Amino acid sequence: DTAAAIRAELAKMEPFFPSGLKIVYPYDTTPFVKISIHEVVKTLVEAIIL
Amino acid sequence: LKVNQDGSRVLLRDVAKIELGGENYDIIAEFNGQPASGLGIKLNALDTAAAIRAELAKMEPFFPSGLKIVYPYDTTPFVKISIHEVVKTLVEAIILVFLVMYLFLQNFRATLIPTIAVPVVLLGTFAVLAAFGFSINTLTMFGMVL
Amino acid sequence: GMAYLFVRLPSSFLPDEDQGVFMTMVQLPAGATQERTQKVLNEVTHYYLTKEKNNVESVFAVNGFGFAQNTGIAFVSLKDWADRPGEENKVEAITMRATRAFSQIKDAMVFAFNLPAIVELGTAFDFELIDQAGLGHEKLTQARNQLLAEAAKHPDMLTSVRPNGLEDTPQFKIDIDQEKAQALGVSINDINTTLGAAWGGSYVNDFIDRGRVKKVYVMSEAKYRMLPDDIGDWYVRAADGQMVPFSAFSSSRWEYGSPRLERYNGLPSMEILGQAAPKSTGEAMELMEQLASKLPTGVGYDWTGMSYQERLQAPSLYAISLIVVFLCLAALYESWSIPFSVMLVVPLGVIGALLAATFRGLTNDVYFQVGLLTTIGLSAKNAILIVEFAK
Amino acid sequence: GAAWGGSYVNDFIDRGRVKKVYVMSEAKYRMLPDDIGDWYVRAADGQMVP
Amino acid sequence: AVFVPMAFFGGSTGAIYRQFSITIVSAMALSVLVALILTPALCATMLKPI
Amino acid sequence: GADAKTVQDTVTQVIEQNMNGIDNLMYMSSNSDSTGTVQITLTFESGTDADIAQVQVQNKLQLAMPLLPQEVQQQGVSVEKSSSSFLMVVGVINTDGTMTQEDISDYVAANMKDAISRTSGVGDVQLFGSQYAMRIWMNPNELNKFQLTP
Amino acid sequence: DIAQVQVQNKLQLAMPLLPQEVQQQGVSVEKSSSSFLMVVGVINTDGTMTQEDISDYVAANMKDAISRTSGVGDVQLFGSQYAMRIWMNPNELNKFQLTPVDVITAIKAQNAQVAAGQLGGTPPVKGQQLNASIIAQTRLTSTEEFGKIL
């Protein structure tokens, strides 16, 4: 929520950017956990089926 | 201030009017055709207001001859009367239920059984609101009646 | 019946109660003096105290205050509720007659109003025009005029749009000729100190009055700071102990500027107050969103205050609780069909609640929903009572 | 101190926002030891001292 | 099961709902304990033999 | 004695930049009047304690205080936690008329404005009037008539 | 939030004792962890903005709005917000016999804000009709305006 409330707080400033400005995410640790937990959930479902 | 060479004194009252005036001249408060002053209290609810009806009750004795206090804008008796009217409707609902109870059971003691229940549960609900940290407010007493 | 009658009944928040008091906003054209504003507050007090003496108790008036030398606020209380019977003596009719006779005053926007139940939501929007690219105040005002003009010209959804901030009024501009200043012998510190202490005063020292600290104020005499050409006076002592007047090293002119510069989230902004046409808040908000998109480049929009509580579900809390009660009843009667017969009585009481709501001309408020759920609970208390014995 | 390190003195308005001003030496005058012998100062008889 | 859900409306409005959603539910619980404890006892003590 | 062209830039701008590094908030309003005073009206997110976020503002306020002008530091700023409704207003009059308009606000500001508002449930009381202050209304003619500056 | 202001109390207690320029640049109580979980970057694809010309737009439009959201303790700006720079020339200073103190005095006396008051002042004489605010020398905006200094 801290990071997603900045992925959205910065989504309001994209329209009025001057011609040329582009945003990059060079160092990001939120998708790391966001994918690790989802893989744990996938292993949960696979344990259900196994 | 400046000391003239001929032994003449130049003071501030010589070049300025000195008076005990107001700090700011933006706000004037005319009450009812008579000049006055006052203060508004910004937001407890009645303990907040009753603790000022008593905090100001200590300053009334030593007021100079002429000063009188008025309450031109007051919203605490509004709620203080609305809740009491809700309580009056509570009592009237008690008696209007007792009427129908006697209309159907035809006995003081028989209708006494459902009549005792309502105030017991209502005081218990007061105690439960004491437990959950709720408040006797414009909307809970209404729920007590509902 | 129930569906058609209920979806066609408008809903509102809370009943506006007669709190024995109301207020009166007094706004005047930018530039009027305190005396000319007291002239209108005079008529306010006159109406409240000397137009109808049946419901008036004490009209606490104040000149030069209310929301922020041309504003004012009239507080007023009403007589005891018993002495004001009928709708003709409640805050609604009192303020209606008042405002109707009040709007006939020249050069004054004065109107009375009641205190809403809660002071955070109030009237169901609050628009904010935002300077997103540093365009400046005098161009954000152009954008605001463009949005305000093409807002009330489409009255199919909204009318009575207005800005919260007030319009720009002329301002007196002085140009201190630095060249002439330092050539004639004066220092700029002396010039600015003299100008600031002669116009606006200065907080310098404190003194003791009857055993308590109060302030002292160096300021011009009243009769020497109320004319433009009085600026040419107020000499200053300089290099060869010489007195220099301002008219010799300062240019004077009129200009334009904002006295109510608003800012939102740290950027220049202007607020807008308006309501939907007798249409919901959502469609009006969408029309404002589209019309704000039809603005010069660099101007943004935002919602705040009385409209931010929304824009982020009663059937969502009902439809699941219905089947939860159905689960309880299924565990009760050891059946799935039998519990349907209990919730079959849900419309039986809601139809009557809706009939009584639309009868008196009332609204589907929070209170109406509370009573609706209470009557549903009693309908269950009866239906379950019957069906338990029947089973 | 103002010739080596600058000094925060005043503020100004840039495009409707406050920013700082900085009095500092030019780059090519503060990168040599013997440049310290420069930077005269005006003194008693209006005289420049190195 | 019909009075509790109203205590979950989010925002400045649902806090209004919470008052009823708690008071009425507590009232149900207390009145049902009454109809289980006091009302049967009182029926056994204050009813005429028919 | 200032303008919105000044206090919006010399006080308001210096605050709106220093209000940064704080817990949950909703929005930051701002006014600027021709009488100088500015109110920013920060806002809670309906779930933050009053005393908790009351000093999150005070921290950045003190952080920005040395940057504000000198007279602004003299008159001072304030962190006034309160609602927007002035539930009850009380008034003081003189029945005999022995005290004038300006002569009624002082006694209520030197004996009541400090004692009343030190009680809880009192966020920020606005004085309809003003406490006494010594005033020296100088005469620029008599100042130059003796060749003196303010 | 409990111990965040226990630090701020003693900080304000020590603030008047610190040097003057330290008070100007200011201190801060930045409650935060030590890990900068996510860093976001801004570039110009067309190259129409230089290195120093990319940090300003991100410090005047994003550095204040982003960090007013919770979960943001202390954001470090890779770069710096714009500032006017006057790179003085000691030769040309002595070539005209001027000290950097004179430059500082000029730019501090001609770029400052002014207390100006209003025509038709707050305490009036009976009969005044027009009341309007006075404006005097305000701040400067660009390099051209700072070029003209007395």
PDB file of C-alpha atoms in Angstrom, chain F:
ATOM      1  CA  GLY F   1       0.665  45.004   6.811  1.00  0.00           C
ATOM      2  CA  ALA F   2       1.255  42.615   3.910  1.00  0.00           C
ATOM      3  CA  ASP F   3      -0.472  41.166   0.850  1.00  0.00           C
ATOM      4  CA  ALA F   4      -1.357  37.792  -0.619  1.00  0.00           C
ATOM      5  CA  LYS F   5       1.363  38.478  -3.199  1.00  0.00           C
ATOM      6  CA  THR F   6       3.765  38.454  -0.217  1.00  0.00           C
ATOM      7  CA  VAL F   7       2.646  36.044   2.517  1.00  0.00           C
ATOM      8  CA  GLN F   8       1.766  33.348  -0.013  1.00  0.00           C
ATOM      9  CA  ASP F   9       5.401  33.531  -1.168  1.00  0.00           C
ATOM     10  CA  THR F  10       7.303  34.607   1.970  1.00  0.00           C
ATOM     11  CA  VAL F  11       5.468  32.410   4.512  1.00  0.00           C
ATOM     12  CA  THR F  12       3.087  30.016   2.761  1.00  0.00           C
ATOM     13  CA  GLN F  13       5.632  28.792   0.204  1.00  0.00           C
ATOM     14  CA  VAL F  14       8.261  28.283   2.915  1.00  0.00           C
ATOM     15  CA  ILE F  15       5.779  26.074   4.799  1.00  0.00           C
ATOM     16  CA  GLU F  16       4.269  24.096   1.906  1.00  0.00           C
ATOM     17  CA  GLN F  17       7.803  22.943   1.036  1.00  0.00           C
ATOM     18  CA  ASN F  18       8.767  22.057   4.627  1.00  0.00           C
ATOM     19  CA  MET F  19       5.579  20.018   5.246  1.00  0.00           C
ATOM     20  CA  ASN F  20       7.207  16.759   4.204  1.00  0.00           C
ATOM     21  CA  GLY F  21       8.093  13.589   6.104  1.00  0.00           C
ATOM     22  CA  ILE F  22       4.885  12.944   8.031  1.00  0.00           C
ATOM     23  CA  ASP F  23       2.447  10.065   8.572  1.00  0.00           C
ATOM     24  CA  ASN F  24      -0.919   9.625   6.816  1.00  0.00           C
ATOM     25  CA  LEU F  25      -2.610  12.800   5.575  1.00  0.00           C
ATOM     26  CA  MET F  26      -5.484  13.653   3.234  1.00  0.00           C
ATOM     27  CA  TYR F  27      -4.719  17.069   1.720  1.00  0.00           C
ATOM     28  CA  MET F  28      -3.153  20.464   2.425  1.00  0.00           C
ATOM     29  CA  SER F  29      -5.336  23.510   1.793  1.00  0.00           C
ATOM     30  CA  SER F  30      -4.065  27.095   1.875  1.00  0.00           C
ATOM     31  CA  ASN F  31      -5.506  30.603   2.190  1.00  0.00           C
ATOM     32  CA  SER F  32      -3.793  33.966   1.749  1.00  0.00           C
ATOM     33  CA  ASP F  33      -5.534  37.230   2.641  1.00  0.00           C
ATOM     34  CA  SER F  34      -4.645  40.901   2.289  1.00  0.00           C
ATOM     35  CA  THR F  35      -4.308  40.987   6.096  1.00  0.00           C
ATOM     36  CA  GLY F  36      -1.350  38.576   5.976  1.00  0.00           C
ATOM     37  CA  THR F  37      -2.573  35.632   8.043  1.00  0.00           C
ATOM     38  CA  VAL F  38      -2.389  32.211   6.373  1.00  0.00           C
ATOM     39  CA  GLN F  39      -4.085  28.964   7.405  1.00  0.00           C
ATOM     40  CA  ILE F  40      -3.027  25.676   5.807  1.00  0.00           C
ATOM     41  CA  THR F  41      -5.582  23.290   7.382  1.00  0.00           C
ATOM     42  CA  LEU F  42      -3.859  19.931   7.224  1.00  0.00           C
ATOM     43  CA  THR F  43      -6.182  16.945   7.523  1.00  0.00           C
ATOM     44  CA  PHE F  44      -6.305  13.536   9.206  1.00  0.00           C
ATOM     45  CA  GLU F  45      -7.315  10.319   7.433  1.00  0.00           C
ATOM     46  CA  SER F  46     -10.241   9.631   9.829  1.00  0.00           C
ATOM     47  CA  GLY F  47      -8.124   7.092  11.721  1.00  0.00           C
ATOM     48  CA  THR F  48      -5.257   9.074  13.244  1.00  0.00           C
ATOM     49  CA  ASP F  49      -5.322  10.257  16.852  1.00  0.00           C
ATOM     50  CA  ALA F  50      -5.517  14.016  17.348  1.00  0.00           C
ATOM     51  CA  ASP F  51      -2.465  14.182  19.621  1.00  0.00           C
ATOM     52  CA  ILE F  52      -0.552  11.773  17.355  1.00  0.00           C
ATOM     53  CA  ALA F  53      -0.660  13.873  14.176  1.00  0.00           C
ATOM     54  CA  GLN F  54      -0.915  17.191  16.037  1.00  0.00           C
ATOM     55  CA  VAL F  55       2.847  17.150  16.630  1.00  0.00           C
ATOM     56  CA  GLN F  56       3.834  15.579  13.314  1.00  0.00           C
ATOM     57  CA  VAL F  57       2.801  19.014  12.039  1.00  0.00           C
ATOM     58  CA  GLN F  58       4.643  20.811  14.860  1.00  0.00           C
ATOM     59  CA  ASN F  59       7.921  19.056  14.020  1.00  0.00           C
ATOM     60  CA  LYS F  60       8.030  20.346  10.439  1.00  0.00           C
ATOM     61  CA  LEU F  61       6.674  23.688  11.669  1.00  0.00           C
ATOM     62  CA  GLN F  62       9.661  24.173  13.976  1.00  0.00           C
ATOM     63  CA  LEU F  63      11.819  22.864  11.121  1.00  0.00           C
ATOM     64  CA  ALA F  64      10.546  25.760   8.983  1.00  0.00           C
ATOM     65  CA  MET F  65      10.402  28.442  11.705  1.00  0.00           C
ATOM     66  CA  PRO F  66      13.950  29.900  11.303  1.00  0.00           C
ATOM     67  CA  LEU F  67      13.266  30.279   7.557  1.00  0.00           C
ATOM     68  CA  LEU F  68      10.202  32.510   7.990  1.00  0.00           C
ATOM     69  CA  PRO F  69      10.567  36.314   8.179  1.00  0.00           C
ATOM     70  CA  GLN F  70      11.509  37.985  11.444  1.00  0.00           C
ATOM     71  CA  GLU F  71       8.178  39.694  12.148  1.00  0.00           C
ATOM     72  CA  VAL F  72       6.475  36.369  11.409  1.00  0.00           C
ATOM     73  CA  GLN F  73       8.587  34.816  14.168  1.00  0.00           C
ATOM     74  CA  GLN F  74       7.687  37.724  16.461  1.00  0.00           C
ATOM     75  CA  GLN F  75       3.934  37.422  15.906  1.00  0.00           C
ATOM     76  CA  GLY F  76       4.511  33.668  15.867  1.00  0.00           C
ATOM     77  CA  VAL F  77       2.818  30.681  14.272  1.00  0.00           C
ATOM     78  CA  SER F  78       0.558  28.153  15.976  1.00  0.00           C
ATOM     79  CA  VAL F  79      -0.528  24.521  15.708  1.00  0.00           C
ATOM     80  CA  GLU F  80      -4.223  24.763  16.619  1.00  0.00           C
ATOM     81  CA  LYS F  81      -5.817  21.315  16.594  1.00  0.00           C
ATOM     82  CA  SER F  82      -9.585  21.823  16.429  1.00  0.00           C
ATOM     83  CA  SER F  83     -12.739  21.239  14.413  1.00  0.00           C
ATOM     84  CA  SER F  84     -14.375  23.940  12.272  1.00  0.00           C
ATOM     85  CA  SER F  85     -17.600  24.499  14.257  1.00  0.00           C
ATOM     86  CA  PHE F  86     -17.712  27.101  17.045  1.00  0.00           C
ATOM     87  CA  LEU F  87     -20.493  25.354  18.955  1.00  0.00           C
ATOM     88  CA  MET F  88     -21.090  28.059  21.574  1.00  0.00           C
ATOM     89  CA  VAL F  89     -20.105  31.732  21.505  1.00  0.00           C
ATOM     90  CA  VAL F  90     -20.369  33.751  24.720  1.00  0.00           C
ATOM     91  CA  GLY F  91     -20.638  37.528  24.828  1.00  0.00           C
ATOM     92  CA  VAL F  92     -19.869  40.280  27.322  1.00  0.00           C
ATOM     93  CA  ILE F  93     -21.573  43.694  27.341  1.00  0.00           C
ATOM     94  CA  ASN F  94     -21.747  46.707  29.646  1.00  0.00           C
ATOM     95  CA  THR F  95     -25.322  47.531  30.632  1.00  0.00           C
ATOM     96  CA  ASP F  96     -24.438  50.929  32.117  1.00  0.00           C
ATOM     97  CA  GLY F  97     -22.391  51.844  29.041  1.00  0.00           C
ATOM     98  CA  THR F  98     -19.372  52.766  31.186  1.00  0.00           C
ATOM     99  CA  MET F  99     -17.171  50.656  28.864  1.00  0.00           C
ATOM    100  CA  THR F 100     -16.834  51.226  25.123  1.00  0.00           C
ATOM    101  CA  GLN F 101     -16.425  48.757  22.247  1.00  0.00           C
ATOM    102  CA  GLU F 102     -12.629  48.570  22.414  1.00  0.00           C
ATOM    103  CA  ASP F 103     -12.945  48.797  26.217  1.00  0.00           C
ATOM    104  CA  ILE F 104     -14.735  45.436  26.598  1.00  0.00           C
ATOM    105  CA  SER F 105     -12.406  43.108  24.692  1.00  0.00           C
ATOM    106  CA  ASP F 106      -9.431  43.857  26.957  1.00  0.00           C
ATOM    107  CA  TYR F 107     -11.037  42.713  30.196  1.00  0.00           C
ATOM    108  CA  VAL F 108     -12.203  39.545  28.433  1.00  0.00           C
ATOM    109  CA  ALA F 109      -8.720  38.995  26.926  1.00  0.00           C
ATOM    110  CA  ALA F 110      -6.726  39.664  30.127  1.00  0.00           C
ATOM    111  CA  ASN F 111      -8.986  37.753  32.542  1.00  0.00           C
ATOM    112  CA  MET F 112     -10.943  35.200  30.477  1.00  0.00           C
ATOM    113  CA  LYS F 113      -9.143  34.476  27.195  1.00  0.00           C
ATOM    114  CA  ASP F 114      -6.327  32.630  29.012  1.00  0.00           C
ATOM    115  CA  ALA F 115      -8.212  30.943  31.867  1.00  0.00           C
ATOM    116  CA  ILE F 116     -11.127  29.614  29.795  1.00  0.00           C
ATOM    117  CA  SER F 117      -9.039  28.182  26.955  1.00  0.00           C
ATOM    118  CA  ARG F 118      -6.744  26.255  29.323  1.00  0.00           C
ATOM    119  CA  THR F 119      -9.637  23.797  29.763  1.00  0.00           C
ATOM    120  CA  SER F 120      -9.953  20.726  27.561  1.00  0.00           C
ATOM    121  CA  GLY F 121     -12.464  20.667  24.742  1.00  0.00           C
ATOM    122  CA  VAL F 122     -11.065  24.047  23.652  1.00  0.00           C
ATOM    123  CA  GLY F 123      -9.025  23.841  20.456  1.00  0.00           C
ATOM    124  CA  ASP F 124      -8.702  27.438  19.261  1.00  0.00           C
ATOM    125  CA  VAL F 125     -10.871  30.285  20.559  1.00  0.00           C
ATOM    126  CA  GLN F 126     -11.286  33.352  18.340  1.00  0.00           C
ATOM    127  CA  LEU F 127     -11.576  36.686  20.156  1.00  0.00           C
ATOM    128  CA  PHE F 128     -14.280  38.978  18.752  1.00  0.00           C
ATOM    129  CA  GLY F 129     -12.263  42.104  19.431  1.00  0.00           C
ATOM    130  CA  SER F 130      -8.661  42.370  20.589  1.00  0.00           C
ATOM    131  CA  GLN F 131      -6.582  42.653  23.738  1.00  0.00           C
ATOM    132  CA  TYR F 132      -5.273  46.111  24.586  1.00  0.00           C
ATOM    133  CA  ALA F 133      -2.041  47.394  23.114  1.00  0.00           C
ATOM    134  CA  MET F 134      -0.288  50.716  23.450  1.00  0.00           C
ATOM    135  CA  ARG F 135      -0.595  52.653  20.192  1.00  0.00           C
ATOM    136  CA  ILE F 136       1.643  55.505  19.094  1.00  0.00           C
ATOM    137  CA  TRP F 137       0.042  57.151  16.059  1.00  0.00           C
ATOM    138  CA  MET F 138       2.955  59.185  14.734  1.00  0.00           C
ATOM    139  CA  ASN F 139       2.545  62.412  12.780  1.00  0.00           C
ATOM    140  CA  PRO F 140       4.756  62.525   9.653  1.00  0.00           C
ATOM    141  CA  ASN F 141       4.425  66.314   9.562  1.00  0.00           C
ATOM    142  CA  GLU F 142       5.681  66.714  13.136  1.00  0.00           C
ATOM    143  CA  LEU F 143       8.303  64.060  12.357  1.00  0.00           C
ATOM    144  CA  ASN F 144       9.628  66.139   9.452  1.00  0.00           C
ATOM    145  CA  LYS F 145       8.848  69.377  11.313  1.00  0.00           C
ATOM    146  CA  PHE F 146      11.656  68.226  13.623  1.00  0.00           C
ATOM    147  CA  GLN F 147      13.495  66.221  10.912  1.00  0.00           C
ATOM    148  CA  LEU F 148      12.977  62.777  12.435  1.00  0.00           C
ATOM    149  CA  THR F 149      12.358  59.362  10.885  1.00  0.00           C
ATOM    150  CA  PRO F 150      10.010  56.646  12.199  1.00  0.00           C
TER     151      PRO F 150
END
